[PDB]
Design a protein around this nucleic acid. Sequence first.
RNA 1: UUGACAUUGUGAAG
RNA 2: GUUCUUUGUAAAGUGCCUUCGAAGAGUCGAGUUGUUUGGGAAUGCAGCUCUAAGUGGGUGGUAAAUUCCAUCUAAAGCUAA
RNA 3: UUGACCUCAAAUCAGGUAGGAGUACCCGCUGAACUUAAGCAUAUCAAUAAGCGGAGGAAAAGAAACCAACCGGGAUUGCCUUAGUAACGGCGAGUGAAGCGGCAAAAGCUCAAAUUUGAAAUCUGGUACCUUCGGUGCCCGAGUUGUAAUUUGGAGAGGG
Lengths: 99, 60, 203, 114
Amino acid sequence: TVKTGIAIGLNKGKKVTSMTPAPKISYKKGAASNRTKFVRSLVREIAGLSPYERRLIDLIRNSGEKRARKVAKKRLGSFTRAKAKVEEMNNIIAASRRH
Amino acid sequence: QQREAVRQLYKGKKYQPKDLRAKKTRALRRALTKFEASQVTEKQRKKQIAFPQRKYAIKA
Amino acid sequence: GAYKYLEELQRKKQSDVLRFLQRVRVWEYRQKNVIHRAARPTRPDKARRLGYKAKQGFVIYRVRVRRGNRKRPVPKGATYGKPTNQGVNELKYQRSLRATAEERVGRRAANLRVLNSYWVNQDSTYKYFEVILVDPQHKAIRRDARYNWICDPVHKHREARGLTATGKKSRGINKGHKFNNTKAGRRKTWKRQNTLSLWRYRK
Amino acid sequence: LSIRLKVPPTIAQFQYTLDRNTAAETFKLFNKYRPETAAEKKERLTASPKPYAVKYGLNHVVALIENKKAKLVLIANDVDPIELVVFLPALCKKMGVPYAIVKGKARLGTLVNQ
RNA sequence: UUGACAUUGUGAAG
RNA sequence: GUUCUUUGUAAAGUGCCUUCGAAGAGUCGAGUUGUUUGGGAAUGCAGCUCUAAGUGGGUGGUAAAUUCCAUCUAAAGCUAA
RNA sequence: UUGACCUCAAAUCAGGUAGGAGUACCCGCUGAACUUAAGCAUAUCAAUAAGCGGAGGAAAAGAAACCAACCGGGAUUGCCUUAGUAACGGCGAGUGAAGCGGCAAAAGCUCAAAUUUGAAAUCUGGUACCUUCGGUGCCCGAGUUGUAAUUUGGAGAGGG
Ligand SMILES: [Cl-]
Ligand SMILES: [Cl-]
Ligand SMILES: [Mg+2]
Ligand SMILES: [Mg+2]
Ligand SMILES: [Mg+2]
Ligand SMILES: [Mg+2]
Ligand SMILES: [Mg+2]
Ligand SMILES: [Mg+2]
Ligand SMILES: [Mg+2]
Ligand SMILES: [Mg+2]
Ligand SMILES: [Mg+2]
Ligand SMILES: [Mg+2]
Ligand SMILES: [Mg+2]
Ligand SMILES: [Mg+2]
Ligand SMILES: [Mg+2]
Ligand SMILES: [Mg+2]
Ligand SMILES: [Mg+2]
Ligand SMILES: [Mg+2]
Ligand SMILES: [Mg+2]
C-alpha cells in the first residue's frame, strides 16, 4: 500500500511515513454479541415463521433454491437481501426435519 | 389599611390571593424559577467540579 | 432485562402470536373515540427509547387517523386553471399521517407538550398511533434537569412547526448532498439563493 | 372475541393456572419471605444478618433466570400487555428454571407491598 | 363502471 | 478583596493484565402513483403494496450481475455566538 | 359477606394550565392566475401572492448513517468565491446548485438498550416550623408494566 511518488498510475501520490490509527469502536456497530444471539434464537422458537417464509421453504424443497431467490427478491427489496434470506431458510430446513 | 391587614393574615403561607401577588407579566410568571433553572444532574455536577474553566495567560 | 425481548418480538409482526394480538386490539380501539386517553403504553419498550418515563407528568394518548390520499377540496372537481393543475384525485399530503395524529392530540391537550409518537396498529380505513405528552407545569418535570428544557416557551407546539421526529423527516432536515434543497430550511435556502447582494464599493 | 377466535399456543398456554390447593401452599411458603417494609426499614438504618426475601420486578427477575439463580418463578396470568410476560415460560424452560402460571397479578403484589 | 391487491379469518367437497 | 461553614472512611482523573463490550422495525430498503429538485434508468417529500439484516446497515451523482476498496453509524434527544 | 386489583366515570372537589392580540423578521401547510415563450397546452411567472396553523428576541440549524478519492478534511450559521458554472429545459423561451479555498463567529453534549437486589437508594402533594424563587420533620400518594446512582461509541463496563 505504498505510493509510487508520481502523479499518475495505480498507486499514485506522495510517499509519507505511515501511521496506524487506533481502531474506532463505532466500526463494530453491527457486530453480534452473546446476549443478542441468545435473544434472537429464543424469539425464533417462540414466534415461529412468517407466511412468506413458509412458502419459500416449500419452493426450496419442490423447485430448488434458484427459484426461491427469485421469489425472495420480489417479497424483499434488493437481490442481495434475497441471498441471505434463502441461506437462513436452508439452515432452518437442515435443523427442522433433516436432523 | 384593609389590604395591609390581609397581608399579615397570609404572611408566610404558600398561597395568597391573586390580587396580592406580584403582577409582572404573564410570560414572566410562567417562566422557571431561579431554583428550577439552575438544576443539574449528579452526572453533570461531577464534571463541573472536576474540570472547570481554568484561568491562564500566555506569558511564559 | 425484559425490554430486549420485547424489541425483538415486536419485529415479527406477521407471526401467529402477533397476528392474533393485532386483530383483537384493532377492534377494541375502533370501539373507542377517535381520540382517547390511554391508561398505559401498549409498547412500554418503544416508549422508553422515545423518551417516556414512568413518572407523574407523562401522559399517553391514542388517536385514530383516516388513511388514503388527500382529495383536492374544489367544487365538482373544477380547478379553473391550466391543465397541469387540473388533477383532483391522485394528490398526496406533504405531511405524514403520523404528523396529523400528533397535531390533533396537541390541540386536545393544549396544556401539555408533545414529545414523540409511535405506530401501534392499522386497518384498511385507519392508522392508529400513541402520542407521548409531558406536562410542563408539573413540579416533577420543572425540577428535573433532564426534562425541564421542554418548559422553555420556545418549545410550545413543537408538532405544529414540525420540530418532532416525524416533522423533521418531512421537512427534509438531514445532512448530505441528497438534502441540498432542505438542509437549512427550504424557504430559508431559497431566500438566500434568490437575494441580490450589493456592497458599498460594488464588486 | 378472544375466545371466539383461534388462539395461538403461545398465548393459549396461559389459560392453565395453578389450582386452588397447591396455589395456597405456594403462597403460604412465599408469605414467609415478605420484603422489609418502610417501617422496619427505619429501625435497621438507625451489623445486620443476611436477608432472605422474595425477588420481584420484571427486569430483575428475567436477569436472575438468565443467570440460573432463580429456584422458583411465579407468573401472573392477567398481564394486559401480554407481550411483557409471554416469553417467560420458554425462557424458564430453556434455562431449566421451574415456573408456575398463577392466577392474579394483584395477589402477587400483595406479598411485595405493591 | 370494471379488474387486481389490502381490509380478510374458520370447515368440507367437486 | 475579606469573612463564616469541612464538606468526607465523599467525589473525580491517570498505568497495566484478563473477560466482555447490550447501540433505536411497518423502520431501513423495494415496487408503484403524485408532487417537487440543477439531480439526469428517477433529488427530496407523501399515499398504497411488499417488508429486512447484525463481520450488519447507509453513502460513494448511469440501470444490472460478480469481486474488492473507501467512508461514516440512520430509523431517539438538548445546546450560546 | 368483607377486602383488594384493573378499567371507566362524577364533583362550584385541592392546585394549575390553554384560547385572544400583534405578526417586520422566523418554523410549516395549502396554493393561483395576469405575465414570458412575439400564437399555445409542457415550461415560465413560482415551489411566489392570497388562504390556514405555530414561536422568539431572534427563530431555525447543529456536534456527521458528512465531504471526499487528497500527503485527506472534520458540528451548525453567515460573508467573499466557486458560478451564470456541472446540470435541467417543446435542449425553445428560460432555469441552475454543491465539494474545495479566504474570512466572521466558535462549544460542547445525553437518553434507550446492564440485577441497587446485602435492602426504590427516586419523586408530586398535605401538614407543622424555619434563614421562604427554597429548607427540615412527619403522614398519605406515585412507582417494580421500573423511579435514582452508574455507561452513550470519542467509547465504556465487571474482576485483579
Ligand atoms: Cl425519469
Ligand atoms: Cl430519547
Ligand atoms: Mg465513526
Ligand atoms: Mg404542492
Ligand atoms: Mg436529462
Ligand atoms: Mg440515471
Ligand atoms: Mg433542536
Ligand atoms: Mg375547584
Ligand atoms: Mg419557513
Ligand atoms: Mg404568449
Ligand atoms: Mg405579445
Ligand atoms: Mg393569448
Ligand atoms: Mg402569504
Ligand atoms: Mg414576546
Ligand atoms: Mg443574535
Ligand atoms: Mg432554538
Ligand atoms: Mg456522534
Ligand atoms: Mg463543516
Ligand atoms: Mg424554479
